[PDB]
Amino acid sequence: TTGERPFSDIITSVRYWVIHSITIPALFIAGWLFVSTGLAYDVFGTPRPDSYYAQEQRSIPLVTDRFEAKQQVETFLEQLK
Amino acid sequence: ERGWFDILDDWLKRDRFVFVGWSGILLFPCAYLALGGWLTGTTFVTSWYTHGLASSYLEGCNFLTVAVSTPANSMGHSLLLLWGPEAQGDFTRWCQLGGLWTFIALHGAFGLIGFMLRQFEIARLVGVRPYNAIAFSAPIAVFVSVFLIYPLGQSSWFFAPSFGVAAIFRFLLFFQGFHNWTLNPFHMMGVAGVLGGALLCAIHGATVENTLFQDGEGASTFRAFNPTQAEETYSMVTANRFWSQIFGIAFSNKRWLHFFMLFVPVTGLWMSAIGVVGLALNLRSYDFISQEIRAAEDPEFETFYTKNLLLNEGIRAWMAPQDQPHENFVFPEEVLPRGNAL
Amino acid sequence: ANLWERFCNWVTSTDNRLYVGWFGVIMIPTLLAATICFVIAFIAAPPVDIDGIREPVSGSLLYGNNIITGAVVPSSNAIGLHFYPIWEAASLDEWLYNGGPYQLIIFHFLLGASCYMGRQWELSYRLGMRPWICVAYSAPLASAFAVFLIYPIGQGSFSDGMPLGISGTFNFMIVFQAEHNILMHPFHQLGVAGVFGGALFCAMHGSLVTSSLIRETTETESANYGYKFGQEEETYNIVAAHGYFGRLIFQYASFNNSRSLHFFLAAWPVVGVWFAALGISTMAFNLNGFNFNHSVIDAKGNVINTWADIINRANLGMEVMHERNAHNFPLDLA
Amino acid sequence: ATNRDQESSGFAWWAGNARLINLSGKLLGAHVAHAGLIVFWAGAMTLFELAHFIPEKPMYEQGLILIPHIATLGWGVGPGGEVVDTFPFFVVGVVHLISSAVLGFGGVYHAIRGPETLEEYSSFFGYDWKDKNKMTTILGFHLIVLGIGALLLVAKAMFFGGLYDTWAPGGGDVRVITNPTLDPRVIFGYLLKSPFGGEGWIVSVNNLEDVVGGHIWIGLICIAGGIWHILTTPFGWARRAFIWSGEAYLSYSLGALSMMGFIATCFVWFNNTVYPSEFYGPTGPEASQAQAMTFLIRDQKLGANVGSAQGPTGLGKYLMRSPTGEIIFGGETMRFWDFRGPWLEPLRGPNGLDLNKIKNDIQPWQERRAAEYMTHAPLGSLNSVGGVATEINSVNFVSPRSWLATSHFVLAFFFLVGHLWHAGRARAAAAGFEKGIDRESEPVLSMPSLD
Amino acid sequence: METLKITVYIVVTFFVLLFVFGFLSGDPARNPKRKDLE
Amino acid sequence: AELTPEVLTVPLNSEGKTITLTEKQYLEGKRLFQYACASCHVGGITKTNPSLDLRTETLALATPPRDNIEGLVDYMKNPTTYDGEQEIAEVHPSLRSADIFPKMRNLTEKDLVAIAGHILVEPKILGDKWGGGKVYY
Ligand code: CLA
Ligand code: CLA
Ligand code: CLA
Ligand code: CLA
Ligand code: CLA
Ligand code: HEC
Ligand SMILES: CC1=C(/C=C/C(C)=C/C=C/C(C)=C/C=C/C=C(C)/C=C/C=C(C)/C=C/C2=C(C)CCCC2(C)C)C(C)(C)CCC1
Ligand SMILES: CC1=C(/C=C/C(C)=C/C=C/C(C)=C/C=C/C=C(C)/C=C/C=C(C)/C=C/C2=C(C)CCCC2(C)C)C(C)(C)CCC1
Ligand SMILES: CC1=C(/C=C/C(C)=C/C=C/C(C)=C/C=C/C=C(C)/C=C/C=C(C)/C=C/C2=C(C)CCCC2(C)C)C(C)(C)CCC1
Ligand SMILES: CCCCCCCCCCCCO[C@@H]1O[C@H](CO)[C@@H](O[C@H]2O[C@H](CO)[C@@H](O)[C@H](O)[C@H]2O)[C@H](O)[C@H]1O
Ligand SMILES: CCCCCCCS[C@@H]1O[C@H](CO)[C@@H](O)[C@H](O)[C@H]1O
Ligand code: OEX
Ligand SMILES: [Ca+2]
Ligand SMILES: [Cl-]
Ligand SMILES: [Cl-]
């Protein structure tokens, strides 16, 4: 043994569960709301189901330049009306 | 001298639940970020703008189809730093441009360095020979040759493997269609090392478990072993006779047996790495010239070699337009190679 | 001691350089027949009409093959699963054109290798060993049954059995991928875990035991001379190896019991290869890998491609090109 | 805690059911409790199938494996296999469900409440694995029970409605079997057929007269042998060839079950008589034939002479000869010419497929059947996408024949492993070295060197 | 061909009978420890 | 892109009248088409006769024209060959032959409209994918 309290000691202690019956559901709900509020879409730049194409377009908005790639994507994003 | 360096050395080598060490300063941040970036990307990040692919749980992919895909072919071999000229410090564009792929690949590379330094560092502290670190050179040679050297020989990072289950499957199939990689004798040696390694693993473990000495009374024989016991727990003499009579030859030297188990998979992975270094340059073992000369002139000559090239030609023509979108391949129906009816 | 008793004592004798035994009585003649026929056919056999469309494929060295392209070619699709011994042909020349040798080899081989497993059980009983080495060998043995017998039965023809050759093996694997999407099947995935894992644990166990060898030699001699065949004492320090590997990860991720360590080394690759053989064996009845073709759709109904759709593009190219002259109707149902 | 820990019993918890080997009262309960689970699944799965069952979809479009078994026995179905009354299905499921409560009650009683050993309680119900006489008697009782079971199928076939006959003139129907085959040349002739293509061993039985007649023989055989094994005790040649222990008898059964599982796998894959295609979907051979039939019909209506149409290889595009001359469908289905089915046989003459029947006698119900079977080929993905591996999502279909064949191949395989495991161990335990080599008595050290 | 067929038929029956009578000839007693398994 | 009322507006008959479907009808059309028709028509092709597909251009050139709701509804009652010359209810699922194609037994008039709408709307979404076969997968 290396000194730390045994894991079976901690996870059968009442205090562990007093703390973690809050903290575990709380993180879960924070993860839920990150998606449910739409925030994950905008953090990572992921398209919503109505944002992959324009209404009539069937072309992929593929990046084709290295140093204007950022403007290419912003331009593609405007073109969604 | 007990200066700050020596004090810090003491704390870094405390015998705790997770050993740290000097090597841990490199290993833990890089291994954690490589992992977290893969989890972040497969959960939240698209491949729409680089590949035309959905690739995250958020888009509706599952564990088999998510990936952190490679950057677009127009990025070349750009390091794709967050603060680089492409993303210009924009975290969202960085993700949409494939920045997570270099992030994972680069932090992964330095994490593996860290892990091998940890094997050296822990072995030096405990007093064993560093053969475990020497064996780990093979995974590093595979990683470096497939994820870094291969795409550096090609046009861009786009053709490196993507970090995902089905994405890797596509890599296998691309290597068959374009590189005829099954024909490559360096892959063949790799296959022999991996399969022979699996064989050695099963046969050694089966042999030990079935030549045990009866060192206890219970029907569960696991209990009858003590880590500090001096005697061997199974009979090498009986093991050797059985295999001599079953198979003709047998191990008799236990040190040789275990060195050979190190040797076989390690060597195979090194051999496969060399082949991939060739494929970085399209230096393939694609054809046998004598077969082609005969087949060109003699339309009755057919081998499994000519049969498989027909398959490769199908793979190339049918997957290329969607697998390489930046190329804008437009193949009309009439040019697609097809057999009768299908 | 009458003659039958003498013969039985010689067959079952633990003093023969190679153990014969009762399985050996079936094993030896069947393996010789398969080996001799294989060698001759690989060198000199004429081309074989594998797919039944009067389009013979050349497999032997004398007819234009090297070691990599050569094969014993599976028997004709016109034969299907019919039994085709030499005596059912009007001539040897007919037998060879239709791929008779393939049947003779695999049927003799599968019997021989099955008796080889029996022989592994049998000698262990004669030596007072525990009996389960043969169980480890059932995983490669089951795999051979899968590609030589089970898959033909489910597809209805030995012409879809694996060819006896190196490039022939690759043909089998590529057509399998196109018709079953084996890469997307969880039993092939467990098989990959089995053999990647088995190779990992092989190098691991080898490196750990080699790392903890007890100093018994000088720097100018091989360390292998520090172990003597039959010595009573262990040749390495398993406490040292556990103390190293336990700190590489954490203490409870390392084995201290050699017996359970070696059991794990047996079990992991054997179980994984069992699943891989069950993959081939159940795709033999067209229960194929996961199909996510066009699974992701946008708000309008546009297909959003995933990596699974790219795989499908590659599978289509294999599908449309394989056996290019053998299909007349639009669906390849077997 | 009798033999309920490792110190006392010698067995770790992960081999804990081995602690039951010599505790016949608790071993009885574990067997009865397990049978309750089998019956439980049968009744419950049947109810689930019924609840999800739409009478106007084909059974094989609905993931049914149990209702097809009930229907083959003559219940719920009329001409063509059309479902006319789902209440028999309901009854079968309910009665199995209720019975499982009786078995579970007995299993849990004998397992945790009744006497742990039956020998001190009853000399009839008690037994010694080593008692060759008692063991063949217990075996004798169960052979008589199994024989009654086989006669019940005959009773249903001959006296209680009959069986569904896919071959019945008209399109298939329930039919009373009035003259089951009794000629032992026929019944045991099936036993001696080759298992290879065109022969098919017992999988080839293609009429209910043979099926019913074979169960009459099996019924008598089992009842005869059961009386034989009650009245006798193993002969000396049998005493010397077998291990006589509980694990050994377990290992023999495991070998038997594996063999049966493989046979069952081939039965459901090839046989369309006792697994009617109306209920289970077409066999793999059947759907492939049905594709060729379909396109011969399409192109002949467009004006093609199918007898003389040379395909790209030089073989006929639609028709060709089998290796023994028979006229058969062309293309890759040449491998399937051994297929026989009620929709195809009217086109068959003495030389195989008959060009004049093909030109003049193809009825629309055959065009329908061939198109149905061609489009329900037993091909599909693990997530139940029907079709070839390259097909797109749309059709939610995997054939019952694929489900049944794959499941039972996997089970049969692992039961062969179990045979090897337990037969090897049984041998070693009888001989006294199943726990390891005796250090001071190692056999190999008393043997001369090989060289 | 007919001679070939009978020859193989005879060779195979020969070896199969050895196998069967072999394992019938007291095989459980052919072990190094307890030699009484009836 | 999304499923707008414009996408869902389709020709009701040949005289040029349109009708606008709800998203509910369209999804009902998709489900019922999977139930009764996709075993042969998955993706707009025809597995038992690949010469005839369900592309709107092909349906326009059928006799009588099938490129509208009325033509498609009529076809599911009394199907004909492409030239209109022969009635093929005996070999093609239809209400007239619901006794030999039992899956048609529980299709109502309103179901036929929804299946029709799905056939007319899908090519507007998938373009060449619809009726294109494996080349466009
Ligand atoms: C079909 C599956 C099955 C069955 C029928 C059994 C049966 C048995 N096991 Mg085994 N076992 C099994 C699977 C099974 N096991 C598995 C999967 C494992 C791995 C974990 C084991 C590991 C194991 C060990 C290590 C041991 C056993 C033992 C036993 C026996 C005594 C159990 C006992 O006394 O507990 C008492 C348990 C309780 C009092 C709790 C409740 C148990 C009841 C019976 C559950 C009933 C619930 C049910 C819904 C009630 C319906 C009633 C209703 C119909 C009226 C009993 C005959 C023991 C033995 O061999 O003794 C000699 C023993 O030591 N088992
Ligand atoms: C009728 C069949 C049968 C019977 C009565 C037995 C009986 C026995 N077996 Mg044997 N065995 C069998 C078939 C059978 N076996 C088969 C088919 C195999 C091949 C795999 C084996 C392989 C085997 C081994 C290797 C061993 C035994 C052992 C034993 C003994 C102890 C078993 C125990 O307590 O396990 C306890 C039960 C468990 C721990 C449960 C295991 C859980 C399984 C693997 C899960 C399977 C997954 C499931 C199907 C699907 C997932 C479900 C999930 C999603 C919820 C007991 C005499 C032991 C022995 O030798 O004693 C003499 C032993 O070491 N058996
Ligand atoms: C004889 C065995 C058998 C067979 C052939 C079938 C077949 C079927 N079932 Mg049924 N069923 C069974 C047993 C069986 N079932 C059991 C035991 C249960 C209780 C759980 C059920 C409860 C059930 C329900 C609730 C449903 C079905 C449904 C179905 C249909 C679709 C199946 C599917 O999509 O699976 C998906 C594929 C898998 C789940 C793959 C499982 C992989 C396993 C876990 C691997 C394990 C291998 C081995 C056992 C372990 C060995 C371990 C080793 C170490 C020894 C199909 C006809 C569906 C249907 O359509 O009904 C109308 C449905 O809804 N079944
Ligand atoms: C086949 C499995 C089986 C076997 C071998 C036994 C054997 C035994 N039981 Mg158990 N038992 C079982 C199943 C079994 N039982 C079931 C399913 C239940 C729940 C109903 C019980 C509930 C039970 C209780 C409460 C008791 C026993 C007792 C006994 C012992 C004395 C029985 C006796 O002499 O009755 C005399 C014989 C009869 C009364 C004949 C019964 C005929 C049956 C009921 C008619 C139908 C039989 C026919 C085959 C039906 C086939 C159904 C099948 C196909 C599903 C004996 C060891 C006694 C005991 O343990 O004493 C300490 C005891 O008190 N059993
Ligand atoms: C559950 C079924 C069952 C079981 C487990 C037993 C078990 C036994 N029987 Mg019994 N028997 C049974 C049913 C059963 N019997 C039935 C239904 C009958 C009436 C037909 C008999 C009539 C009977 C007689 C007359 C005798 C036995 C005897 C025995 C004992 C010797 C077994 C043996 O050595 O076989 C091994 C089998 C052989 C040696 C012959 C097979 C030859 C080789 C292996 C080729 C066959 C393999 C091949 C692949 C099979 C494919 C199919 C084939 C038809 C072509 C053993 C305890 C013997 C005994 O001791 O009685 C007291 C004995 O003399 N039984
Ligand atoms: C296989 C048994 C089929 C099923 C199920 C369905 N259809 Fe079908 N369809 C099938 C064939 C062989 C043909 C060609 C018939 C001919 O000889 O002309 C068709 C044709 C159609 C058409 C006409 C297509 C055209 O371009 O004119 C339509 C509109 C059509 N089928 C619709 C349809 C519907 C709505 C179905 C479900 C109720 C359906 N089909 C099922 C084969 C099969
Ligand atoms: C990228 C990046 C970064 C990082 C981040 C991170 C670090 C993250 C992490 C993250 C994480 C850390 C995540 C995690 C996740 C996890 C999960 C999501 C899990 C899941 C699981 C499951 C699902 C399970 C399953 C299973 C198995 C596996 C087996 C057993 C059984 C079961 C089934 C249970 C930074 C900021 C620096 C910068 C920017 C970029
Ligand atoms: C011994 C043992 C064991 C086992 C046990 C078992 C196995 C048991 C079984 C049991 C059983 C086997 C039971 C059963 C029961 C049943 C029941 C309880 C039923 C009921 C039913 C009902 C109630 C019904 C109802 C109904 C009707 C009538 C009509 C229709 C509808 C419905 C469904 C509603 C274990 C492993 C745990 C371990 C320990 C030991
Ligand atoms: C019902 C029916 C039928 C009939 C059937 C029959 C009649 C059957 C019989 C069957 C039989 C009658 C079988 C038998 C079997 C047997 C076996 C399977 C055996 C085995 C053996 C063994 C296993 C042995 C072994 C050994 C050896 C070899 C050596 C010595 C030692 C020992 C003993 C180990 C038919 C088809 C008509 C139709 C359908 C229905
Ligand atoms: C198609 C397969 C047909 C198989 C038919 C099987 C029928 C069974 C009838 C009994 C036949 C067994 O006949 C068997 O033969 C030999 C003599 O040749 C006997 O003799 C044996 O005795 C002992 C047995 O412990 C052995 O050590 C000895 O090596 C051997 O000679 C066996 O004790 C006898 O059991
Ligand atoms: C073992 C439970 C038996 C319950 C009773 C089953 C009767 S079965 C019944 O028998 C009739 C003949 O009289 C047939 O006409 C009818 O179709 C059939 O269902
Ligand atoms: O032979 Mn060899 O490969 Ca199984 O699919 Mn059909 O057949 Mn042929 O085609 Mn694809
Ligand atoms: Ca008796
Ligand atoms: Cl091919
Ligand atoms: Cl074809």
d(Cα D373, Cα B123) in Å, to the nearest integer?
A: 66
**DSSP conformational letter for F74:** H
R_g of chain B computed on alpha carbons: 26
| E31: closest CA of chain D, how far (Å) | 7
Domain ranges of chain D: 1-281+378-451, 282-377
| A51: closest CA of chain F, how far (Å) | 6
- What residues are paired with C57 via a beta bridge? C48
Q: Residue F64: is the preceding peptide bond cis (ω within 30°)?
A: yes
Helices (H), chain F: 23-36, 38-41, 56-60, 69-77, 109-126
Which strands sit side by side in the sheet containing D348-349, from one edge to the other?
Answer: D319-321, D327-329, D352-353, D348-349
Record the resolution, in angstroms: 2.4
Q: What are phi and psi of B163, to 5 degrees?
A: -85, 85
d(Cα D95, Cα D103) in Å, to the nearest integer?
A: 12
**DSSP conformational letter for C236:** B
Helices (H), chain B: 4-12, 23-44, 48-51, 91-96, 99-126, 131-135, 137-144, 150-153, 165-179, 185-209, 236-247, 254-279, 289-297, 304-323
CB B265 within 8 A of CB B193: yes
Closest Cα to atom 5 of ligand 11: D160
Cα dihedral B32, B151, C291, D402, rounded to 10, equals -100
State both tokens at C116.
Answer: 């080889």
Nearest one of B304, D334, D322 to C74, comparing CA atoms:
B304
The greatest distance separating any two alpha carbons of chain A, rounded to the nearest whole angstrom, comes to: 66
The amino acid that residue B162 corresponds to is S
Q: Which residues contact B322 (CB under 8 A, 6 or more apart)?
A: B52, C305, C309, C310, C313
- The answer to whether C300 contacts chain A (CB < 8 Å) is yes
| From E5, E8, E25, residue closest to C8, measured CB to CB | E25
Give residue C175 CA to ligand 14 midpoint distance, Å.
7
Q: Write out residues 133-192 of C within 8 Å (CB-CB) of B.
A: 133, 135-136, 139-140, 163, 165, 167-168, 170-171, 173-175, 177, 183-184
Q: Chains with 3 or more CB pairs closer than 8 angstroms to B?
A: A, C, D
Return the residue in A52, A56, A58 with the most chain F beta carbons within 10 A, the one to mutate for interface testing: A58
Any contact of C with B, at least 3 CB pairs below 8 A?
yes
d(Cα D63, Cα D380) in Å, to the nearest integer?
A: 13
SS (HEC) of A23-59: HHHHHHHHHHHHHHCCHHHHHHCCCCCCCCCCCCCCC
- What residues are paired with C213 via a beta bridge? C236
CB D173 within 8 A of CB D78: yes
* Burial status of residue B282 (CB atoms within 10 A of its CB: 0-12, 13-18, 19 or more): exposed
Nearest one of A40, A41, A42, A45 to A72, comparing CA atoms:
A45
State both tokens at D109.
Answer: 């009683």
Which residues in D20-50 are b (16+ Cβ under 10 Å) and which e? bbebbbbbbbbebbebbeebbebbebbbebb
- Other CB atoms within 10 Å distance of the CB of residue D19: 22
To the question of whether residue A20 is assigned a binding role by annotation, the answer is yes
Return the SS3 of D243: coil
Q: What element of type H or E holds D221?
A: helix D208-231
Alpha carbon distances (Å) from D320 to B146, B340, D42, D314: 51, 18, 47, 10
Q: Write out residues 4-33 of C within 8 Å (CB-CB) of E.
A: 4-5, 8, 11-12, 22-23, 25-26, 29
CB C81 within 8 A of CB B314: no
Closest chain F residue to C293 measured between Cα atoms?
A: F137
For CA atoms D229, D235, D237, D238, give the dihedral sign: positive
d(Cα C148, Cα C168) in Å, to the nearest integer?
A: 13
Q: Is the CB of D38 under 6 A from ligand 8?
A: no
Q: Is the CB of B233 under 6 A from ligand 7?
A: no
To the question of whether residue F41 is assigned a binding role by annotation, the answer is yes
The DSSP-derived string for A55-77 is: SS--S------SSSHHHHHHHHH
| E35: closest CA of chain C, how far (Å) | 11
Please count the structural domains in chain A. Answer: 1
Return the SS3 of F20: strand
Q: What element of type H or E holds C71?
A: strand C71-72
List chain C residues with CB under 8 Å of F44: none
Nearest one of D382, C153, F134, C205 to B64, comparing CA atoms:
D382
Q: Chains with 3 or more CB pairs closer than 8 angstroms to F?
A: A, C, D
**DSSP conformational letter for D176:** -
CB D13 within 8 A of CB D6: yes
The amino acid that residue D374 corresponds to is M
- The answer to whether F2 contacts chain A (CB < 8 Å) is yes
**DSSP conformational letter for D399:** -
d(Cα D390, Cα D398) in Å, to the nearest integer?
A: 15
d(Cα C283, Cα C193) in Å, to the nearest integer?
A: 19
To the question of whether residue D61 is assigned a binding role by annotation, the answer is no
Q: What are phi and psi of D175, to 5 degrees?
A: -150, 135
Return the SS3 of D175: strand
Give residue D100 CA to ligand 8 midpoint distance, Å.
6
To the question of whether residue D217 is assigned a binding role by annotation, the answer is no
Q: What element of type H or E holds D84?
A: none
Q: What are phi and psi of D243, to 5 degrees?
A: -80, 140
Give residue F76 CA to ligand 6 midpoint distance, Å.
9
The greatest distance separating any two alpha carbons of chain E, rounded to the nearest whole angstrom, comes to: 50
d(Cα F114, Cα F29) in Å, to the nearest integer?
A: 4
- What residues are paired with D163 via a beta bridge? D175
Give residue D86 CA to ligand 11 midpoint distance, Å.
15
Cα dihedral D305, D310, D316, D317, rounded to 10, equals -70
Angle, alpha carbons C150-C156-C158 (nearest 5°): 65
The amino acid that residue D223 corresponds to is I
d(Cα D113, Cα C26) in Å, to the nearest integer?
A: 52
From the CA of D228, which ligand is nearest?
Answer: 5
Please give the CATH number for the structural domain made up of C3-196+315-322. Answer: 1.20.85.10
d(Cα F40, Cα F30) in Å, to the nearest integer?
A: 14
CATH number at residue A55: 1.20.5.860
d(Cα D194, Cα C254) in Å, to the nearest integer?
A: 54
Cα D177 to the center of its chain, rounded Å? 22
Closest chain A residue to C252 measured between Cα atoms?
A: A1
Cα dihedral C309, C314, C316, C317, rounded to 10, equals 150
Give residue D112 CA to ligand 4 midpoint distance, Å.
15
Q: What element of type H or E holds F35?
A: helix F23-36
List chain F residues with CB under 8 Å of A54: 1
Q: Which residues contact D345 (CB under 8 A, 6 or more apart)?
A: none
* HSE (side-chain half, CA atoms, 13 Å) at D235: 3
Strand D380-381, strand C287-288: pairing: parallel
- Other CB atoms within 10 Å distance of the CB of residue D141: 12
Q: Which residues contact B249 (CB under 8 A, 6 or more apart)?
A: B243
d(Cα C254, Cα C244) in Å, to the nearest integer?
A: 9
Q: What are phi and psi of B156, to 5 degrees?
A: -175, 175
CB C124 within 8 A of CB B210: yes
**DSSP conformational letter for D433:** -
Ligand 3 atom nearest to C186, measured from its CA: 42
- The answer to whether C291 contacts chain B (CB < 8 Å) is no
d(Cα D275, Cα D283) in Å, to the nearest integer?
A: 9
Angle (deg, nearest 10), helices C238-248 and B99-126 = 150
Closest Cα to atom 2 of ligand 4: D32
- The answer to whether C50 contacts chain D (CB < 8 Å) is no
Residue F133 backbone class (left: φ over 0; alpha: ψ -120 to 50; beta: rest)? left
List chain A residues with CB under 8 Å of C304: 52
CB C52 within 8 A of CB C26: no
Q: Is the CB of C49 under 6 A from ligand 12?
A: no
CB D449 within 8 A of CB C230: no
State both tokens at B162.
Answer: 């993507």
| From A2, A50, A58, residue closest to C299, measured CB to CB | A50
CB D394 within 8 A of CB C104: no
State both tokens at B187.
Answer: 């892959």
Q: Write out residues 27-56 of F within 8 Å (CB-CB) of D.
A: 34-35, 38-40, 42-43, 47-49
Q: Is the CB of D111 under 6 A from ligand 1?
A: yes
State both tokens at D128.
Answer: 């010694």
Q: Taking CB atoms and a 6 Å cutoff, what residues make up the pocket around ligand 2? A: D 14-18, 250, 254, 414-415, 417-418, 421-422, 425
Q: Is the CB of D117 under 6 A from ligand 3?
A: no
List chain A residues with CB under 8 Å of F2: 50, 55
d(Cα B13, Cα A38) in Å, to the nearest integer?
A: 46
Return the SS3 of B212: strand
CB contacts < 8 A (B, C): 397
d(Cα C318, Cα D86) in Å, to the nearest integer?
A: 46
d(Cα F130, Cα F58) in Å, to the nearest integer?
A: 12
Method: X-ray
d(Cα B263, Cα C203) in Å, to the nearest integer?
A: 7
- The answer to whether C218 contacts chain F (CB < 8 Å) is no
Nearest one of C26, D195, C11, C23 to E14, comparing CA atoms:
C26
In a domain, A20, yes or no: yes
For CA atoms B225, B226, B227, B228, give the dihedral sign: negative
Range of the domain at A18: 7-79
- The answer to whether D445 contacts chain E (CB < 8 Å) is no
d(Cα B116, Cα B81) in Å, to the nearest integer?
A: 26
d(Cα B160, Cα B168) in Å, to the nearest integer?
A: 10
* Burial status of residue A39 (CB atoms within 10 A of its CB: 0-12, 13-18, 19 or more): exposed
Cα dihedral C278, C279, C283, C288, rounded to 10, equals 140
- The answer to whether the Cβ–Cβ distance between B217 and D15 falls below 8 Å is no
List chain E residues with CB under 8 Å of C25: 15, 18-19, 22
Domain ranges of chain F: 1-137
Q: Is the CB of F32 under 6 A from ligand 6?
A: no
Return the residue in D298, D437, D449, D450 with the most chain B beta carbons within 10 A, the one to mutate for interface testing: D437
Surrounding residues of ion ligand 14, Cβ less than 5 A: B 307; C 322-323
- What residues are paired with B161 via a beta bridge? none
- What residues are paired with D385 via a beta bridge? D396
Q: What element of type H or E holds D319?
A: strand D319-321
Q: What are phi and psi of B270, to 5 degrees?
A: -60, -40
- What residues are paired with B163 via a beta bridge? B68
The DSSP-derived string for C106-153 is: HHHHHHHHHHHHHHHHHHHHHTT--STHHHHHHHHHHHHHIIIIIHHH
- Other CB atoms within 10 Å distance of the CB of residue B160: 23
Helices (H), D361-436: 364-374, 400-431
* Burial status of residue B62 (CB atoms within 10 A of its CB: 0-12, 13-18, 19 or more): middle
Residue with tokens 């009309």: B332
- Other CB atoms within 10 Å distance of the CB of residue C229: 11
CB contacts < 8 A (A, B): 83
| E29: closest CA of chain D, how far (Å) | 8
d(Cα D60, Cα C277) in Å, to the nearest integer?
A: 28
Q: Which residues contact D105 (CB under 8 A, 6 or more apart)?
A: none
Cα C112 to the center of its chain, rounded Å? 15
CB C130 within 8 A of CB B211: yes
Alpha carbon distances (Å) from C333 to A50, B162, B217, D167, D327: 38, 33, 58, 25, 21
